[PDB]
Amino acid sequence: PKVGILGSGDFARSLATRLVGSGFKVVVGSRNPKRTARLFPSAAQVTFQEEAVSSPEVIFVAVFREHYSSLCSLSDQLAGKILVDVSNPTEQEHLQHRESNAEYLASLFPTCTVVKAFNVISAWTLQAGPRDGNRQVPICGDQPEAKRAVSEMALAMGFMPVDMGSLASAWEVEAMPLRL
């Protein structure tokens, strides 16, 4: 507790499932929480975006890059928080954009600290994937405290965090193939 997630799709919902199964309290921010809540694990509290971001210290940004700027109205609430960029760009997106999605996200929310994590993990692995601790997540970011928070979370969820350095490493991390 309390971990935030912005977004309502397959990845959001799988993250929520894993977090709840790992003893975290979870709040989800959706544009249509009424509709979205129906499919989410009951233990997660699905609410409006504004209200979902205010409590948590760590917020997973489980939306596509093209929708990042739509979150700008949440800036005053998000101030000083940890944002997790989970995006797994296609080969073409990766090559088209000079900066990583994670760096782009950092630029949009300069008062937040961004950690890149979970891009190489499938939604089904999140849902089902055995809590053997064998499955590696690469993790980077500029802030050691933020990286530790996300790494401990990864461990509690049964993954094995691998430190890949500063947020400048996010471009190479975003090139890593999704497993599997």
Asked if the peptide bond before residue 180 counts as cis, ω within 30 degrees of 0, the response is yes
Compare residues 128 and 176 and give the one whose CB is closer to its own copies. 128
Compare residues 24 and 40 and give the one whose CB is closer to ligand NAP. 40
Q: Residue 158 interacts with its own copies (CB under 8 A)?
A: no
Residue 136: half-sphere exposure toward Cβ, Cα within 13 Å: 7
Residue 97 marked as a ligand binder: no
Q: Residue 67 interacts with ligand NAP (CB under 6 A)?
A: yes
Is 29 in contact with 54 (CB distance < 8 Å)?
A: no
Residue 101 marked as a ligand binder: no
Of these, 86, 139, 150, 157, which contacts ligand NAP (CB under 6 A)? 86
Whole-angstrom distance, CA of residue 33 vs CA of residue 40 = 10
Q: Residue 134 interacts with ligand NAP (CB under 6 A)?
A: no
Whole-angstrom distance, CA of residue 15 vs CA of residue 109 = 22
**Which window, 6-14, 72-80, 102-110, 139-147, contacts ligand NAP (CB under 6 A)?**
6-14
User: Token match 């053997």: residue?
Assistant: 132
